[PDB]
C-alpha cells in the first residue's frame, strides 16, 4: 500500500556494477553565470537546477547579476538588527577539508564531534571578530620576525519585522527559489517549518562544518553565501544515499540523526562520484533533491539558506519516497506529504503529466485508505462525528509515534491529543473513551479528486 506507483518513477538510469575511471569519480560541479538579470528568470535556468542529472548546481555572483544587498546580512548589520537574538553554537575541532581524524591523527573516521550550546548573536559576533584578529596577528609577527573552534548555526530569521529588510531582499530571485511560492510544495503546508519554508542563518569560522546529510523529505536546499569567506562543498547525488548510510552503520552512527563526515577514499573505493567545489561571496548554491551534501568554512563568512519545494516529478516523487522511508525507521516527516498533497491538488494548476499522475495516484490511495478504515469503524460499531476543518489548519501527527494523522482522527482528553488507530487501540482496547472524527466525507475527496485535471 504505497503512495508511490514503481511504473511511475522519474528516477534516472545509474549503474553501480559498472566500472568508473578516475575522472568520472571527481566530476565538473554544474555551473551558471548569469550574463542577463532575465535569464536568472529563464525556464531554461529552472529546467537545469531541477533535473536529475543535475546532483548540485552553483549560480555565479547570483547576487551581483540581482543587485542583492548582502550588507543587509552582514554580522555588523544582524549585531543591529538583533543583538540579544539566541543562536545554537557547535564545537568542534578544526581540519583540513577533505579530512576527519581521530585524536591523534593516526586515522581516518566517519564519526563527527560537534558540541551544542547556545549565545547571543552579539556575543558570537565578538567570537567571530577576536577570532579574525588573533588569526591576523599570529600572521603579522611572523611577518615581523588541536584549534578548537565554535560554529553559529541554525540562527532563525522567521520573524518579518526584525528581518523585514532581510527577507524583501530575497523577493528578487526567481520564484522556484523564494521563501514562499505557489509553484512551492512547502507553501502549502499550511503551518510554519522553522528552517525549510523560513530563512536560516549560518554565522562561521575558518574550519565550521556541517556534517554528512539529505534535507528534511528530500527537499531541495537555497544557499547563499554572504561572504567574505569561500565555504567549501562537498555533494554525492541521490542515487548512492543508501551506500553512504551503510557506512554509517558499519561505523555506528546513525545515518539520519548522526553526525557524520565522510571518507572521502572511502566513497572513491566505492565507485561514487563526488562533487567538490568552492563557494564564494554572492555564489548562490542549488541542492536538487535529495542530495547528500556536507559543508566546510574555509574563510570567515556568513551563509544563509532555507527549503524550497519544487513542483516536479522528480522532487515529488523523491519526497514522497522519504516519507515513507521516514515511517519504517520511525523517523517523524517534518512535511506532511498527504495534507500537502491535497492542498496542491486543489490550489495549483499541473500541466506536467509525470507529475500529475503521482499526485493523482497519491490522491487515490489516501481516499482507499480513508475507505477502508471509515468501514472498519463502522462494523466495530464506533460511531465517526464529523468534524470541518478549520481555516488556515495545520495537519495533524500521532503524539505517541509521530505518523502524519489525516482525515480522521483519534481523540483524547488529558486538553485535547490526537493519535492513529494503532496508537489510540494500544492505549484502549475498544477507542473506549476515544473520540474519532472525521475531517471530510468520502465526498468532498471524491469531488476534489474528480475535478484535479490535468492543465494545459
Ligand atoms: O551551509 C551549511 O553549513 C549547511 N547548509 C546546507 O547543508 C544546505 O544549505 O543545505
Ligand atoms: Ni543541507
Ligand atoms: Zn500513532
Given at each position: ?16 556494477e ?84 581521530d585524536?591523534?591523527g ?5 564519526p ?9 548573536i ?18 603579522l ?9 565554535k ?96 557506512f ?18 572511502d ?34 563568512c ?31 516527516s ?16 499541473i ?16 481516499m ?89
Open positions: 500500500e504505497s503512495y508511490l506507483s514503481p511504473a511511475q518513477s522519474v528516477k534516472p538510469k545509474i549503474n553501480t559498472e566500472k568508473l575511471p578516475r575522472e568520472k569519480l571527481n566530476p565538473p560541479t554544474p555551473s551558471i553565470y548569469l550574463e542577463s538579470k532575465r535569464d536568472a528568470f529563464s525556464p531554461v535556468l529552472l529546467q537545469f537546477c531541477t533535473d536529475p542529472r543535475n546532483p548540485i548546481t552553483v549560480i555565479r555572483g547570483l547576487a551581483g547579476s540581482l543587485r542583492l544587498n548582502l550588507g543587509l546580512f552582514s554580522t555588523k548589520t544582524l549585531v543591529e538588527a538583533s543583538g540579544e537574538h539566541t543562536v545554537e553554537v557547535r564545537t568542534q575541532v578544526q581540519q583540513p577539508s577533505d579530512e576527519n581524524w585524536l591523534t593516526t586515522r581516518q573516521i566517519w563527527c564531534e560537534s558540541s551544542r550550546s547556545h549565545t547571543t552579539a556575543k558570537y559576533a565578538q567570537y567571530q571578530a577576536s577570532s579574525f584578529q588573533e588569526s591576523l596577528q599570529e600572521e609577527e611572523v611577518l615581523f620576525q588541536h584549534h578548537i573552534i560554529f553559529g548555526t541554525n540562527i532563525d530569521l522567521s520573524d518579518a519585522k526584525r528581518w523585514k529588510p532581510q527577507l524583501q531582499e530575497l523577493l528578487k530571485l526567481p520564484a522556484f527559489m523564494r521563501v514562499t511560492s505557489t509553484g512551492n510544495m512547502l507553501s502549502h503546508v499550511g503551518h510554519t517549518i522553522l528552517g525549510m519554508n523560513t530563512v536560516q542563518l549560518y554565522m562561521k569560522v575558518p574550519g565550521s562544518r556541517t556534517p554528512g546529510h539529505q534535507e528534511n523529505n528530500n527537499f531541495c536546499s537555497v544557499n547563499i553565501n554572504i561572504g567574505p569567506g569561500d565555504c567549501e562543498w562537498f555533494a554525492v547525488h541521490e542515487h548512492y544515499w543508501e551506500t553512504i548510510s551503510a554509517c552503520d558499519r561505523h555506528g552512527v546513525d545515518y539520519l540523526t548522526g553526525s557524520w563526515w565522510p571518507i572521502l577514499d566513497l572513491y573505493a566505492s565507485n561514487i562520484p563526488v562533487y567538490r567545489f568552492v563557494q564564494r561571496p554572492g555564489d548562490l548554491v542549488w541542492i536538487n533533491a535529495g542530495t547528500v551534501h556536507w559543508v566546510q568554512a574555509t574563510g570567515w556568513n551563509n544563509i539558506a532555507w527549503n524550497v519545494g519544487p513542483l516536479t516529478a522528480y522532487q515529488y516523487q523523491l519526497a514522497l519516497e522519504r516519507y515513507e522511508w521516514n515511517e519504517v525507521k520511525n523517523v517523524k517534518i512535511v506532511p506529504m498527504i495534507h500537502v498533497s491535497w492542498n496542491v491538488a486543489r490550489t495549483v494548476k500541466s506536467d503529466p509525470d507529475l500529475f499522475k503521482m499526485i493523482k495516484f497519491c490522491l487515490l490511495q489516501s482507499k485508505h480513508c475507505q477502508v478504515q471509515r468501514e472498519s469503524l463502522v462494523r466495530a460499531g464506533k460511531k465517526i462525528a464529523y468534524q470541518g476543518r478549520v481555516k488556515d489548519e495545520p495537519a495533524y501527527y500521532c503524539n505517541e509515534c509521530d505518523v502524519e494523522v489525516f482525515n480522521i482522527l483519534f481523540v483524547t482528553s488529558e486538553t485535547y491529543l490526537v493519535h492513529c488507530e494503532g496508537c489510540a487501540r494500544r492505549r484502549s482496547a475498544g477507542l473506549q473513551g476515544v473520540v474519532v472524527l472525521e475531517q471530510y466525507r468520502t465526498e468532498e475527496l471524491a469531488q476534489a479528486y474528480d475535478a484535479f485535471t490535468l492543465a494545459p
